Write a protein that binds this ligand. Structure first.
Ligand SMILES: CS(=O)(=O)N1CCC[C@@H]1CN
Length: 166
């Protein structure tokens, strides 16, 4: 029961024009089995378009590669990102938390996706009452990318709606 291929791909931007299918594969095979690895090139000149993609056998292998950033590939720091579900942001909206969800609930849950920098539990401008949603800001976009492709998020017993923010 393999994870969907779309969830096992990493788009690699910022490639050296010298990077090849073979050299990109040799690099990223350090973090797992690669079922696909392509450098995008011009159809007429064969000159590199400066980006490519690798497909791992499992999602855990994608995580391993992302946790090994920064990647310097053939002398150039590249920019890996998970495939589109790119709106590259570090902040999420968390809705459906009602009035009893506190900072530590959100922190304890979301800290396993990435390093948290800000947690903002929203309150009513007039009364101070909790409005039932929050924003979490991480230090890096991959946390958010992992979060928003999950079907479900359960925090403080609530089934929450989570999406990318601004
Ligand atoms: C992640 S990487 O393979 O590009 N690279 C950067 C420094 C550590 C490692 C070299 N072994």
């Amino acid at each position: 029961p393999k994870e969907p291929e779309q969830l096992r791909k990493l788009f690699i931007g910022g490639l050296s024009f010298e990077t090849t299918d073979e050299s990109l594969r040799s690099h990223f095979e350090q973090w797992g089995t690669l079922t696909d690895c392509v450098v995008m090139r011009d159809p007429n000149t064969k000159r590199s378009r400066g980006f490519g993609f690798v497909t791992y056998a499992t999602v855990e292998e994608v995580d391993a590669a992302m946790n090994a950033r920064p990647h310097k590939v053939d002398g150039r720091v590249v920019e890996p990102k998970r495939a589109v579900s790119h709106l590259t942001v570090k902040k999420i909206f968390v809705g459906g938390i009602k009035e009893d969800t506190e900072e530590h609930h959100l922190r304890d849950y979301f800290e396993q996706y990435g390093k948290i920098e800000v947690i903002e539990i929203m309150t009513d401008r007039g009364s101070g009452k909790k409005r039932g949603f929050a924003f979490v800001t991480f230090d890096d976009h991959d946390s958010v990318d992992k979060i928003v492709i999950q079907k479900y998020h359960t925090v403080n017993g609530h089934n929450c709606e989570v999406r990318k923010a601004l």
